[PDB]
Amino acid sequence: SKGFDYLIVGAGFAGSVLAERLASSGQRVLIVDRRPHIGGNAYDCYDDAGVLIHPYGPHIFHTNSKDVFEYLSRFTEWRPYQHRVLASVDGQLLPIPINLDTVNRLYGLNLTSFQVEEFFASVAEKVEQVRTSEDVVVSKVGRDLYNKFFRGYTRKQWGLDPSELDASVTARVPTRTNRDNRYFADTYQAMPLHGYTRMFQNMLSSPNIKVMLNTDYREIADFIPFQHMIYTGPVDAFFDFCYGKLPYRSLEFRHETHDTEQLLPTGTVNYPNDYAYTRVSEFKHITGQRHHQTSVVYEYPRAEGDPYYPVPRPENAELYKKYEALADAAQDVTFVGRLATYRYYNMDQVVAQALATFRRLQG
Amino acid sequence: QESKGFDYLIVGAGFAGSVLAERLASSGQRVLIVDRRPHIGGNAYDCYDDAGVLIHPYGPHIFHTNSKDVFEYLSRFTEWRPYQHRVLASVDGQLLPIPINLDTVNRLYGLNLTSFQVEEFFASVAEKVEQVRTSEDVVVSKVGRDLYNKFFRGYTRKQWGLDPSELDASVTARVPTRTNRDNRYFADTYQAMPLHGYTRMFQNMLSSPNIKVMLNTDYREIADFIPFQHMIYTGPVDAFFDFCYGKLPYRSLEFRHETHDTEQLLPTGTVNYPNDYAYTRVSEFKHITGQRHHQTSVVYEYPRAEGDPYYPVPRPENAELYKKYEALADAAQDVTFVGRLATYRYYNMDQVVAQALATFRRLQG
Ligand SMILES: Cc1cc2nc3c(=O)[nH]c(=O)nc-3n(C[C@H](O)[C@H](O)[C@H](O)COP(=O)(O)OP(=O)(O)OC[C@H]3O[C@@H](n4cnc5c(N)ncnc54)[C@H](O)[C@@H]3O)c2cc1C
Ligand SMILES: Cc1cc2nc3c(=O)[nH]c(=O)nc-3n(C[C@H](O)[C@H](O)[C@H](O)COP(=O)(O)OP(=O)(O)OC[C@H]3O[C@@H](n4cnc5c(N)ncnc54)[C@H](O)[C@@H]3O)c2cc1C
Ligand SMILES: O=c1ccn([C@@H]2O[C@H](COP(=O)(O)OP(=O)(O)O[C@H]3O[C@H](CO)[C@H](O)[C@H](O)[C@H]3O)[C@@H](O)[C@H]2O)c(=O)[nH]1
Ligand SMILES: O=c1ccn([C@@H]2O[C@H](COP(=O)(O)OP(=O)(O)O[C@H]3O[C@H](CO)[C@H](O)[C@H](O)[C@H]3O)[C@@H](O)[C@H]2O)c(=O)[nH]1
């Protein structure tokens, strides 16, 4: 071989799906990551005690797309799992998303599904145009439930009030009149049976894929031959922050192991109103691993650190537009992924995006 | 005229490559380390299996050394679980200590020798050999022909596809005969396993910012276009020189992994089978790792003539062939050869580490 058809930057879902697709169509692919491991944020591994964990926070796979689910199925088997989260509020562990039981338990009511609908209507606030993260919630369940479940959590997570964020943020967590307590109502809910990393290895295993780790693309870009680049990192950095830093929100993770089989009643407990952390997660709930000990992770929001979240709001959408135009003009570069196109995407969404990009590149 | 690129391209991420990658990196050299396998660690790589048991995909690796410096060097990259490996040989339907010792002899023949008598006993069955050269010679001249047939001949024939008469003495000489009651497989000063396994240790070794790690990559797919100033090669020597003198024999293995629904399958880390079955041995990883788990994973090793090279085959016809490749190696301007495969040496892990450290001091001189 004398070079590569593609240099792919980042070995998370965005990069790896494209690597898999290009390589299976005959292309020579070099995939690179500044991190010492593949998988990006979805990387998993065994900790010191032998528990399978997610070093970058709990990643629960879920999708409504049959195509996405069947695509991933090529690379892993599944453990069925429907994630459930409780919120700590007024000293109780209550379902989030808010549902019938959340409301009845919180206030000691005995409303039926039909009645809880009118109760919501009786407390809701009228908003002419729903635009912010405050609007979406307050206009649906009213001020008190907003205060109890969203305001505090949102401020802690983003360093911003919900009125300061686009509606699309808090609207991720739909409110319900029914008694569904799953965090997701997606059609397909399941975890890679032996974890994500195993899945990524299968994904990246073709002979046409060379993997370079612990490596910034800029370190090798001058002297490795390649026709096209797929970039999945932060956009602002790609253009040397020429228009200023595009805000991304970060996280610090405090992992702990405990000498019992179970610490929590569910996979994740949220803390809208207490503590420095937004939530704790316990991995055995998610992986189904059996073990005599247990490992959990506490997440603390951070203004600095590796970028994990775009911050959806008008001034950032605007700043992003500028970077987007440089991106659109970059000739032999395709931008794809949560960080690179500045979209608050779920794993399955990134997969679909990568798949659609491959089709265009081909197709 | 062209990009100088990396100071060193290192082929293979086993002990040989990784130790040199770490040393060169710490001195400020830019390193690209490549392996055709999809993981680091060479033969010593370990990982958790489908059941969550820590295993060694390429057979049991027990760390042991007499070198305090090798032990301390590695200690920079891992903590340790103390462990002294013990092997039992299946002979006459009993599980007996190998290396052969006092208890082995007493139990096998129904004797009651003391340590002072078993020496005299050995003396009385030993065959003399004016010059020891063969793997047959080393054994038969110390413990005689019956003990040789029971513990060594069959195992050796099965492992190498050669009779011990066709191997250099150094192969069977690896397993000393004892007149004491020591049942450890090794008597080395430092015996201990990387607390969280080899892979974790290797990851720490290759963590430097000056180290770029390329997996799933034959160096040959890369060497035409990636600029490097010097090469460190740790693969088989014959292949490097396009088998221009014919195939250098390396012995291979096939591994069959199993997980059983019990806490413990075997009484020790490894049971050898000199006289039974197609496999040479079974090993049970929890003995070696100290891992706690409600199931257990084991591996059976089948000797293969064909496949990835794991052992040089020490005997005169092969040392002959290697000598020729070695002259080519010594002459190759910007390439240095290191490790079990590249220098055709039947080395344990610690010896490869020592080789790599010594090569580093030479490069730096
Ligand atoms: C705490 C947390 C929980 C989450 N939970 C879920 C969940 O439960 N369910 C769900 O569906 N999704 C979840 N996600 C989101 C999910 O992680 C994303 O969809 C996923 O990250 C998308 O992958 P990606 O390829 O776009 O980016 P990434 O995973 O971030 O990968 C991009 C890669 O690019 C690399 N890179 C950047 N710059 C360079 C450079 N210069 N050189 C080399 N490499 C570079 C990075 O190191 C990175 O690994 C969660 C995310 C977080 C942070
Ligand atoms: C079954 C078995 C059991 C063992 N048990 C013990 C033990 O108990 N105790 C002990 O001390 N030692 C043990 N060893 C010995 C130990 O494996 C070796 O000393 C050590 O692993 C060798 O290190 P290395 O770097 O020299 O070679 P390797 O581990 O073999 O690594 C060389 C690397 O180079 C790579 N390579 C080769 N060609 C290319 C190419 N062209 N392109 C890219 N990469 C290439 C290979 O993939 C390989 O990973 C055992 C060995 C085996 C096989
Ligand atoms: O109890 C809550 C939960 C959410 N929110 C608000 O709604 C937003 C979106 O909530 P997410 O649960 O989607 O937050 P994350 O992205 O940080 O969490 C990640 O891990 C979660 C646990 O699985 C979910 O899967 C989620 O989809 C996944 O992206 C939060 O930022 C916040 O503004 C709350 O105010 N209170
Ligand atoms: O029961 C035996 C043991 C050894 N031998 C002979 O002596 C040789 C060298 O024996 P090794 O035990 O060193 O064989 P290995 O290199 O294959 O074993 C590897 O795996 C082992 C784990 O059980 C030990 O850690 C050993 O040191 C490690 O290099 C064998 O090839 C064979 O010729 C026997 O004939 N019979």
Number of the ligand closest to the Cα of A351: 1
Distance B201 CA to ligand 2 centre (A): 15
Which residues between 201 and 230 in chain B have a beta carbon less than 8 angstroms from any beta carbon of chain A? 203, 206-207, 209, 211-217, 221-222, 224-227
Whether the Cβ atoms of residue B161 and residue B318 lie closer than 8 Å to each other: no
Listed by the residue before each break, gaps in chain A with C–N over 2.5 Å are none
* Six-digit token string for A195: 């974890």
Interface test with A, best of B33, B46, B225, B297 (most A CBs within 10 A): B225
Q: Under CATH, what is the fold of the domain B1-84+186-249+315-365? A: Rossmann fold (3.40.50)
Nearest partner of A313 among A216, A237, A248, A240, judged by Cα: A248
**Cβ-nearest to A224 among B216, B221, B225:** B225
Question: What is the number of other CB atoms lying within 10 angstroms of the CB of residue A67?
Answer: 11
Chain-chain contact of B216 with A194 (C-beta, under 8 angstroms): no
The type of residue at B317 is: E
Give the start-to-end residue ranges of the domains of chain B. Answer: 1-84+186-249+315-365, 85-185+250-314
| Beta-carbon count within 10 A of A183 CB | 21
Nearest protein CA to atom 12 of ligand 4, as residue: B175
- The domain A1-82+184-247+313-363: what is its CATH number? 3.40.50.720
Deposited experimental method: X-ray
Distance CA A124, CA A313 (A): 24
Distance of alpha carbon B276 from alpha carbon B28, whole angstroms: 53
Separation of first and last alpha carbons in chain A = 25
* B191 φ, ψ (degrees, to nearest 5): -125, 115
Nearest residue on chain A to B52, alpha-carbon basis? A50
Q: Is B293 touching A (CB cutoff 8 A)?
A: yes
Q: Report CA(B114)–ligand 4 centroid distance (Å).
A: 27
Chain A contact present for B196, CB below 8 A: yes
Nearest CA to ligand 3 atom 32: A154
Please report the atom of ligand 2 found closest to the CA of residue B58. 1
Could you give the CA distance from residue B364 to residue B352 in angstroms, rounded to a whole number?
Answer: 18
Q: Distance from the CA of B274 to the center of ligand 2, in angstroms?
A: 24
Q: Does B52 contact A291 at a Cβ distance shorter than 8 Å?
A: yes
For ligand 1, atom 7, the nearest C-alpha belongs to A59
Give 3-state DSSP helix, strand, coil % of chain A, rounded to 5: 35, 20, 45
Sign, CA dihedral A178-A184-A190-A194, equals negative
Pick the residue whose CA is nearest to atom 34 on ligand 3.
Answer: A150
Q: Is B304 touching A (CB cutoff 8 A)?
A: no
Output the CA A56–ligand 1 centroid distance in Å: 9
Query: Cα–Cα distance between B251 and B305 in angstroms, integer?
Result: 6
Rounded Cα distance, A123 and A145, in Å:
9
State whether residue A109 is helix, strand or coil. coil
- Enter the resolution in angstroms: 2.4
Q: Which residues lie closer than 8 Å to B126 by C-beta, 6 or more apart? A: B140, B141, B142, B143, B144
Binding residues of A for UDP: 149, 153-154, 157-158, 172, 183, 270, 279, 309, 344
Q: Which long-range contacts (CB under 8 A, 24 or more apart) does A145-154 make?
A: A145/A98, A145/A103, A148/A89, A148/A90, A148/A106, A148/A272, A148/A273, A149/A87, A149/A89, A149/A96, A149/A98, A149/A272, A150/A272, A151/A272, A152/A272, A152/A273, A153/A87, A153/A270, A153/A271, A153/A272, A153/A273, A153/A278
Which 8-state DSSP code applies to residue A306? S
